[PDB]
Design a binder for these strands. Structure first.
Lengths: 208, 83, 99, 99
RNA sequence: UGGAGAGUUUGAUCCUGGCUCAGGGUGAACGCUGGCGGCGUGCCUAAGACAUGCAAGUCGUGCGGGCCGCGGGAUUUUACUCCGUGGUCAGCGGCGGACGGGUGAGUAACGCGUGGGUGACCUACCCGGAAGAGGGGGACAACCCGGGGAAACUCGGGCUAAUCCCCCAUGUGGACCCGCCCCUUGGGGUGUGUCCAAAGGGCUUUGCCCGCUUCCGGAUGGGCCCGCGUCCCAUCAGCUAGUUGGUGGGGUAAUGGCCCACCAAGGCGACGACGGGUAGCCGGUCUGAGAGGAUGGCCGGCCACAGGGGCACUGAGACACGGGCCCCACUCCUACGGGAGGCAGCAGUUAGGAAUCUUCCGCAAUGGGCGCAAGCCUGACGGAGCGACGCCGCUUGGAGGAAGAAGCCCUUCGGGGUGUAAACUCCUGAACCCGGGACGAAACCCCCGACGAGGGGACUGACGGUACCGGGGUAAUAGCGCCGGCCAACUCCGUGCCAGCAGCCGCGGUAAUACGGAGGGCGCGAGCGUUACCCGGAUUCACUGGGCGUAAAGGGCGUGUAGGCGGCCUGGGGCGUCCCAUGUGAAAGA
């Protein structure tokens, strides 16, 4: 499931700083501050001209490995897009962004998507009051993503809200900090995200 | 003898019936002569019963005994309520 | 509607019966070209009223025989023993065609 | 290993007998009738035909010769009797025939 | 809203051309691996053989009895007998066993699909309307008495009831001949003549209920006919005696050579008859930009079959899977004379096979049969079981955490890597424990009202103490494939044309990024690979969309048969073609 194992190891390999540990992959070592080259024996060895394939592949691995997601699951969303009305590339990003396990992250209740996931799986989170435990739950506009008033007193929930006390958030996300609740205003637009990834290549990888 | 009755759609533990007229000898979920409503025994939608009540009255008029429980429902939507 | 067809009588060498040749044409299902095609029908003639060459209407009917299923409606035009000639040629074409 | 509704069979045999019976008499009378006509008889010819007619309609009452299978044999009898009678003289007795 | 190409013929090139790979799919199976749940799904082979159990009954409100009981009567003598009632057993009689369920063998065909015909027809039960049910007679089982057989069963004799059978009556009406009228295939109407009805049962017994009869109609379900469409071989070219038509009969509900007698000599074929091979067909499914290809499992529709072959009986309906008769093969019983049987119903067994489940629970729901009803029956069904077989969701943790432990791998001997990975600190808390706990089920039924409408009440849950809710609570599973090019991922040993690899091109002969191993890396993840098959790419059968001077490909040349194709002008017809409206295109699926 998910991924399991070494994360700020793909921080590397992709060659762009991934935030997959949240707090540390963020602070004078996501190893991109130390060894910003791919892992293993042949790491700091001379690259070769990468192939038109290799390129499209990593970009997909990049986009997917960000959101922490199954290839099988990823690819369903992609196809689920495309046929859907409008520009495939964005929409996909939209749908990826509408995943609970990520909204919860985006909305500050957790420091990583990985940790954000666990909060969902352990019912610490609610959508419109009803307790939801599916990291895949597709959040539509107007939904309110609450903290379980039952879980409010956790050292993790406290500490991770006190950080966003001042912090500003997503031009499509509201956030009441003290009553520990937030809103899904609208699907983001490609430009709303500074995703270090070219979605057009990800379209291309699934075209050949 | 043609019958107003229930045909079963939906899934396992997800019963959803279709108020249908059909020759009695056909299979339960076999072909039917006309759909004239539906019914969700679990009332999970605010609309878990519906009946084209003109048609219900038609099929009776040409003679078509309803299942005892299919007539229960026809009653509910006043197929038999007059004046 | 009982299908009403019109063809040519190409035989009356049967009692109270005429073989009628109905030709049909259409856009070939795959290749577009309009192709022609045709079928003889055994048509019921109680008064042996029609003969070789008459072009006749022909109607879908209550069965009279194994294979008599049409009765002769009206006559459209006499003569036309050219069309008859063409059928007869195709036939004896087949003669010089065996081993 | 015994479907007590194999009495269904038993009964079939009884009905078989009854049917075969009624029928076998219809026949014998019908023939006896058209024979008298073909011999140019007046009274007794119809008188038996009238009897036969009855027996047909009667048999029609149940499952023997139901319907209008009945009507057939009636139609064929009166047709065959009257014609056979008019192939000779004297059409007498009101009998079953229309004036 | 839709189209990607690559490797490989050469020392090198362009082209032709095949092979091959990347994608999607499957009722799969096989290998290594395998935690949870939901919804699906699971003999593709021998339509081989089958043990055992269940799979179609029901009605006492149609009728008369046997056997086991209880109770009450006539007598004041208890032997004999009348009545009432409870089991129970078949029998007569009715409705259902033609539905539901299974399989694809056969079938290249009006089997299917689609659109129509029926003036050529049928339809039990249900609905609506019109009109009826008056008399009499009869039998057969059950039961009783014999006889034959080992058995299965069977023959005879006697008694008896009914909604069983028959006769007479009334004829609203209907049938048939004939005549006439309308209408046009046998459609409707009318007139003499003939012919044809019925059953009773229950009570909340004079007024209702369940039934009966004849007729017109309605609804539903079917039969039959026709137009078009429906695979491969022409190394199958000629086929045909019920053959093609007629007249008359038979037969059916009904047309028809469907069948028969007799007369005529026809009918079919390159637009592919006849013959051979293969095959159930469709809605749809997979694939493709599309056109197309392939396919028809599960679900729905039609068809056909019920060990193999005929056949008919009953009946509204069958030529009937769990009805009948005969022949065949097979299995059992056998006193050798004769019998019994038919999972391609659900389970299960066995055999074949690479391979396919429980001899489970429940009629609680839906649906079907019978019943006035209560109910009885239902392996249809609704559920649980098994199998990563498929799809979907979820888990094996989360946040910290060294200029970086050890171990192992490289190393140019400084160093590099596995690697924030672990160890270790905090946090959450799959599993598991306790508590509570469903919807699915309100009808038939009773009461009120009027057995109507409406109102009121009662019973009932297989799944199941499952789902879901609340409380407690443990850091708690990872494998498989690949790393020469195509294609994403590289170093070191071992090995020395050996052992071995290999989808194609090709690797191995002492430094192998290709073999075997280790480290590392890439790709997926409760899966990953493999093999088989289908579409793709393959414009490589080219309709969209190809070609033939030398690449495969112009017939050795003519003549002209059928067939294809046709100059300029005008007019008619409107068959092709085009437009509008309308009907059809079921459901599911997309």
């Amino acid at each position: 499931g998910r991924y399991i194992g070494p994360v700020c190891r793909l921080c590397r390999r992709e060659g762009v700083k991934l935030y997959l540990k949240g707090e540390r992959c963020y602070s004078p070592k996501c190893a991109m501050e130390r060894r910003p080259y791919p892992p293993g024996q042949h790491g700091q060895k001379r690259a070769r001209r990468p192939s038109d394939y290799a390129v499209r592949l990593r970009e997909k691995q990049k986009l997917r490995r960000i959101y922490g997601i199954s290839e099988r699951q990823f690819r369903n969303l992609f196809e689920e897009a495309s046929k859907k009305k409008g520009v495939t590339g964005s929409v996909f990003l939209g749908l990826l962004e509408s995943r609970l396990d990520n909204v919860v992250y985006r909305l500050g209740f957790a420091v990583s998507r990985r940790q954000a996931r666990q909060l969902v799986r352990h019912g610490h989170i609610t959508v419109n009051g009803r307790r939801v435990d599916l990291p895949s739950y597709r959040v539509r506009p107007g939904d309110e993503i609450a903290v379980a008033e039952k879980s409010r007193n956790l050292e993790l929930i406290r500490q991770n809200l006190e950080a966003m006390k001042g912090r500003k958030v997503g031009p499509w996300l509201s956030l009441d900090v003290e009553g520990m609740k937030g809103k899904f205003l609208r699907l983001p637009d490609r430009e709303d995200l500074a995703l270090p990834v070219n979605e057009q290549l990800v379209i291309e990888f699934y075209s050949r | 003898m043609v019958k107003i009755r229930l045909a079963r759609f939906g899934s396992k533990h997800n019963p959803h019936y279709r108020i249908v007229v059909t020759d009695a000898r056909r299979k339960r979920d076999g072909k039917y002569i006309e759909k004239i409503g539906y019914y969700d025994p679990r009332k999970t939608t605010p609309d878990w019963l519906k009946v084209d009540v003109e048609r219900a009255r038609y099929w009776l008029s040409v003679g078509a005994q309803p299942t005892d429980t299919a007539r229960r429902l026809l009653r509910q939507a006043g197929v038999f309520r007059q004046e | 509607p009982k299908k009403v067809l019109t063809g040519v009588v190409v035989s009356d060498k049967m009692q109270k019966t005429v073989t009628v040749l109905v030709e049909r044409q259409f856009p070939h299902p795959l290749y577009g070209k309009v192709i022609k095609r045709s079928k003889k029908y055994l048509a019921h003639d109680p008064e042996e009223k029609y003969k070789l060459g008459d072009v006749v209407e022909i109607i879908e009917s209550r069965p009279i025989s194994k294979r008599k299923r049409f009765r002769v409606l009206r006559l459209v035009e006499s003569g036309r023993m050219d069309l008859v000639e063409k059928y007869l040629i195709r036939r004896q074409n087949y003669e010089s065609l065996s081993k | 290993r015994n479907l007590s509704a194999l009495k269904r069979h038993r009964q079939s045999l009884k009905r078989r007998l009854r049917n075969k019976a009624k029928k076998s008499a219809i026949k014998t009378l019908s023939k006896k009738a058209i024979q008298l006509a073909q011999e140019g008889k007046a009274e007794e010819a119809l008188k038996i035909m009238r009897k036969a007619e009855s027996l047909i309609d009667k048999a029609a009452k149940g499952s023997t010769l139901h319907k209008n299978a009945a009507a057939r044999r009636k139609s064929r009898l009166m047709r065959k009797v009257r014609q056979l009678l008019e192939a000779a003289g004297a059409p007498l007795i009101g009998g079953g025939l229309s004036a």
